[PDB]
Design a protein around this motif. Structure first.
Motif, PDB file in Angstrom:
ATOM      1  N   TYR A   1       0.818  -1.222   0.000  1.00 61.28           N
ATOM      2  CA  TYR A   1       0.000   0.000   0.000  1.00 61.28           C
ATOM      3  C   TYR A   1       0.843   1.260   0.000  1.00 61.28           C
ATOM      4  O   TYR A   1       0.575   2.167  -0.790  1.00 61.28           O
ATOM      5  CB  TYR A   1      -1.025  -0.001   1.166  1.00 61.28           C
ATOM      6  N   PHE A   2       1.886   1.333   0.821  1.00 58.24           N
ATOM      7  CA  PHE A   2       2.740   2.502   0.819  1.00 58.24           C
ATOM      8  C   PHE A   2       3.444   2.693  -0.540  1.00 58.24           C
ATOM      9  O   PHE A   2       3.563   3.824  -1.022  1.00 58.24           O
ATOM     10  CB  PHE A   2       3.773   2.460   1.928  1.00 58.24           C
TER      11      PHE A   2
ATOM     12  N   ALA B   1       2.526  12.508   2.607  1.00 58.55           N
ATOM     13  CA  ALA B   1       1.090  12.692   2.539  1.00 58.55           C
ATOM     14  C   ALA B   1       0.590  13.765   3.518  1.00 58.55           C
ATOM     15  O   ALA B   1      -0.598  14.071   3.517  1.00 58.55           O
ATOM     16  CB  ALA B   1       0.369  11.382   2.791  1.00 58.55           C
TER      17      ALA B   1
ATOM     18  N   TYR C   1       1.011   4.241  -3.038  1.00 63.79           N
ATOM     19  CA  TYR C   1       0.949   5.702  -2.936  1.00 63.79           C
ATOM     20  C   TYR C   1       1.943   6.354  -3.882  1.00 63.79           C
ATOM     21  O   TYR C   1       1.605   7.308  -4.578  1.00 63.79           O
ATOM     22  CB  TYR C   1       1.213   6.170  -1.505  1.00 63.79           C
ATOM     23  N   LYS C   2       3.163   5.814  -3.926  1.00 65.40           N
ATOM     24  CA  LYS C   2       4.206   6.340  -4.826  1.00 65.40           C
ATOM     25  C   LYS C   2       3.809   6.192  -6.298  1.00 65.40           C
ATOM     26  O   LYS C   2       4.180   7.022  -7.099  1.00 65.40           O
ATOM     27  CB  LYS C   2       5.569   5.672  -4.558  1.00 65.40           C
TER      28      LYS C   2
ATOM     29  N   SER D   1       6.092   7.902   3.678  1.00 65.69           N
ATOM     30  CA  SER D   1       4.804   8.041   3.014  1.00 65.69           C
ATOM     31  C   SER D   1       3.836   8.936   3.836  1.00 65.69           C
ATOM     32  O   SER D   1       3.134   9.785   3.276  1.00 65.69           O
ATOM     33  CB  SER D   1       4.197   6.665   2.773  1.00 65.69           C
TER      34      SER D   1
ATOM     35  N   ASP E   1      -2.299   8.672  -4.531  1.00 65.33           N
ATOM     36  CA  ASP E   1      -3.576   8.546  -3.834  1.00 65.33           C
ATOM     37  C   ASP E   1      -3.346   8.340  -2.338  1.00 65.33           C
ATOM     38  O   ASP E   1      -2.910   7.259  -1.902  1.00 65.33           O
ATOM     39  CB  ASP E   1      -4.392   7.390  -4.406  1.00 65.33           C
ATOM     40  N   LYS E   2      -3.681   9.363  -1.552  1.00 68.65           N
ATOM     41  CA  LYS E   2      -3.434   9.327  -0.103  1.00 68.65           C
ATOM     42  C   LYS E   2      -4.153   8.207   0.651  1.00 68.65           C
ATOM     43  O   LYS E   2      -3.705   7.831   1.737  1.00 68.65           O
ATOM     44  CB  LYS E   2      -3.728  10.683   0.554  1.00 68.65           C
ATOM     45  N   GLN E   3      -5.218   7.653   0.085  1.00 69.31           N
ATOM     46  CA  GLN E   3      -5.925   6.525   0.698  1.00 69.31           C
ATOM     47  C   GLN E   3      -5.028   5.279   0.869  1.00 69.31           C
ATOM     48  O   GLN E   3      -5.184   4.534   1.816  1.00 69.31           O
ATOM     49  CB  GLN E   3      -7.186   6.156  -0.102  1.00 69.31           C
ATOM     50  N   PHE E   4      -4.089   5.064  -0.050  1.00 71.31           N
ATOM     51  CA  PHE E   4      -3.092   3.997   0.136  1.00 71.31           C
ATOM     52  C   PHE E   4      -2.237   4.140   1.401  1.00 71.31           C
ATOM     53  O   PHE E   4      -1.893   3.146   2.041  1.00 71.31           O
ATOM     54  CB  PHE E   4      -2.188   3.897  -1.102  1.00 71.31           C
ATOM     55  N   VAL E   5      -1.890   5.363   1.759  1.00 73.35           N
ATOM     56  CA  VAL E   5      -1.093   5.626   2.924  1.00 73.35           C
ATOM     57  C   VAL E   5      -1.940   5.333   4.177  1.00 73.35           C
ATOM     58  O   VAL E   5      -1.440   4.781   5.169  1.00 73.35           O
ATOM     59  CB  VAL E   5      -0.594   7.073   2.949  1.00 73.35           C
TER      60      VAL E   5
END
Length: 669
Positions: free
Chosen positions: A433-434, A481, A437-438, A477, A442-446
């Motif tokens: 998930y982190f 974020a 984000y890269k 991350s 999408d900040k939801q992954f963090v």
């Protein structure tokens, strides 16, 4: 210094106990062979006993020597007679070192051929628990180097003295492993080692002699010095895996100048330069595949190095990534595993659906360690920006979030969610998930990464020695974020874990194996990252305390399979198609040590560790093939319980983590 002492079994003539005088821990360097250490390990496996297959025309008979025809009162001379073959063992303690001479003589009337000739050397390499391992067991580094074969047995806690075995006459060509199995302590023992002599042809009255010295030493440098003092040689290469077109430099070092030293590359003579007690070869590597370098010296001696040539590394990784996407991702709406990166059967050229009987279904399922395929594809995406990877990864990450996790971030490894809830799996999901984000911004992954880690700490507490706890990645991350409250909270959670690891020190709790490299390496991997994020010296001081314990798992043998590759010996069973316990060299978790060396170089500025990190991850490239296929383990010994090994297991399962760590070490990703 530390003279060798022994007890000889009066009925078999084997060495039943081998100790070093002045070792305050009083370690026995061999497994007990009276059934009291392992009930199935009895007196036929005593040190110095052995076996051979004798062939005379159509007549083939395997013999095992166990009952002497003559044994001296002091046990230092033992004579066996097995058919036509006389086996004489002469032992002497000379300046504190045990010197053993084995002679095999054909006393018959016709020539005989001997095949699979081996002497048991039951080094005490097993994992009863951390405390006994650290003080009283040894990582046994075996080198099948012919005339220059050796064993370097390093006490697992790194405390001196250690033990060495150096061949001084004859040769050891390979080794075998005996007594592995689910009912024979499963992953918790390396089993019983047998050193293989060359196959022999003995005319009537002819003999073959093998001699070695067994001796105490103070560590790798002292071992090497003593090996050279005893008249053997050390071979090394600049690297063990080469890209096509690179130049190899292969060195053979002795104490004194070698006489008539020549060399071969895959059986073809190549020039040698001699400069005093160094003989070397420098050649271009112009064709993909195995390269064996042989040195021939002193009339009748030989030894070797094992190297690999690949097309080139960038293309190797590209091909693997494309294979994962095009062959190992489930693409079938109306399979619930749609989007999953899955185990693949390289013999059948098909995804393995885990719908057939095997020794442990959960280790061939659609989650858990198979997360590494997603983490690899992200890292390769970050380099290449391949839109097909991004689309594949969005599907994978959805599969993981929706099918492998509950709404509250409890994390399973299969779509049924009826199987185990295992702490390891959460770290790898969070890493994914982190990384996502890269890929996406999408900040939801963090958030999902952070909440997965919280779910893990809630359920398993703070002292689980998980592999690849994403400390730097997770905190970076969160910083990027802008999630300030979550950053400091996660940082506090990592500090708690750090304090548990520091307080435990070398009292490592048992996990899926009682003591092993993928408990020790992750401890240090975590602590080094925690140091790099906090600057608190207490974590670096613990790293430095634990480093020698981690380094003890690794040999320096001149083979890409072995060189700085941690001893691991069970994953072929749990993860492979062939389900073979036994030495896996390399197994991809050896790359965690590479990660550790990479972080340690960042922590200390010691760039020798970065070069070592590079070597570790480079040597794991042999698990990846030029058509994009990969293997979950190389089964290394000659045989395991009589079954032929020396093969790559035909499943691609979890090995793509080796490339995850390759890209960490080489590119900081």
């Amino acid at each position: 210094n530390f003279p060798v002492e022994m007890r000889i079994n009066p009925s078999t003539g084997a060495i039943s106990e081998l100790t070093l005088k002045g070792d305050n821990r009083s370690m026995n360097w061999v497994v007990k062979t009276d059934g009291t250490q392992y009930p199935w390990v009895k007196d036929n496996y005593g040190w110095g006993l052995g076996y051979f297959t004798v062939v005379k025309g159509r007549e083939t008979v395997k013999r095992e020597w166990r009952i002497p025809v003559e044994i001296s009162p002091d046990g230092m001379k033992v004579l066996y007679r097995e058919g036509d073959i006389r086996i004489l063992i002469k032992r002497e303690i000379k300046q504190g070192d045990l010197v053993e001479e084995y002679s095999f003589t054909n006393e018959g009337e016709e020539p005989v051929s001997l095949y699979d000739v081996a002497v048991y050397t039951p080094f005490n390499d097993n994992y009863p628990d951390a405390q006994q391992c650290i003080n009283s067991r040894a990582h046994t580094h075996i080198w099948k180097g012919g005339s220059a074969a050796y064993v370097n047995a390093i006490r697992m806690g790194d405390f001196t003295p250690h033990l060495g075995l150096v061949v001084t006459d004859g040769a050891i060509r390979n080794y075998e492993i005996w007594e592995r199995g689910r009912k024979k302590a499963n992953s918790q023992t390396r089993g019983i080692i047998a050193l293989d002599l060359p196959d022999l042809l003995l005319k009537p009255g002819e003999s073959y002699s093998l001699e070695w010295h067994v001796f105490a030493h103070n560590g790798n440098d002292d071992f090497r010095h003593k090996l050279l003092e005893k008249g053997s040689v050390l071979v090394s290469c600049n690297k063990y895996v080469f890209e096509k077109g690179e130049k190899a430099r292969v060195e053979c070092r002795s104490l004194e100048p070698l006489e008539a030293c020549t060399a071969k590359m895959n059986g073809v003579p190549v020039p040698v330069k001699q400069e005093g007690n160094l003989c070397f070869v420098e050649v271009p590597m112009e064709q993909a595949g195995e390269v064996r370098f042989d040195f021939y010296y002193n009339g009748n001696k030989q030894t070797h190095a094992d190297c690999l040539v690949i097309s080139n590394t960038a293309d190797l990784i590209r091909k693997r990534v494309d294979f994962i996407r095009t062959r190992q991702q489930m693409n079938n709406p109306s399979d619930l595993r749609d989007g999953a990166y899955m185990v693949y059967d390289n013999e059948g050229d098909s995804i393995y659906l885990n719908d057939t009987p095997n020794c442990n279904p959960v280790d061939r399922d659609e989650g858990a360690e198979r997360l590494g395929m997603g983490v690899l594809l992200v890292k390769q995406y970050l380099l290449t920006k391949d839109p097909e990877l991004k689309q594949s990864l969005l599907r994978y990450a959805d599969f993981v979030r929706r099918k492998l996790q509950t709404d509250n971030y409890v994390t399973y490894s299969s779509v049924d969610q009826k199987n185990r809830n295992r702490g390891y799996n959460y770290m790898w999901v969070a890493e994914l998930y982190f990384q996502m984000y890269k890929v996406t911004g999408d900040k939801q992954f963090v958030t999902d990464g952070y909440k997965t880690l919280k779910s893990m700490f809630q359920q398993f507490g703070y002292g689980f020695y998980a592999i690849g706890i994403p400390v730097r990645l997770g905190l970076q991350s969160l910083k990027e974020a802008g999630m300030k409250k979550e950053y400091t909270d996660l940082r506090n959670d990592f500090i708690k874990t750090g304090d548990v690891f520091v307080k435990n020190g070398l009292n490592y709790p048992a996990h899926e194996v009682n003591y092993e490299q993928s408990i020790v390496a992750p401890a240090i991997q975590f602590l080094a990252q925690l140091y790099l994020e906090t600057g608190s010296q207490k974590y670096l001081d613990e790293v430095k305390r634990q480093m020698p314990v981690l380094e003890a798992f690794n040999g320096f043998q001149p083979s890409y399979h072995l060189n700085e590759v941690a001893i691991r010996h069970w994953d072929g069973h749990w993860f492979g198609k062939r389900e073979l316990f036994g030495d896996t060299f390399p197994h991809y978790w050896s790359t965690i040590t590479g990660a550790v060396y990479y972080y340690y170089a960042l922590c200390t500025g010691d760039s020798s560790y970065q070069k070592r990190a590079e070597n570790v991850v480079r040597n794991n490239l042999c698990l990846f093939f030029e058509d994009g296929k990969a293997s979950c383990a190389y089964m290394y010994p000659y045989k395991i319980d009589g079954v032929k090994a020396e093969f790559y297991d035909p499943y691609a399962n979890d090995q793509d983590w080796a490339l995850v760590y390759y890209l960490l070490v080489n590119r900081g990703l």
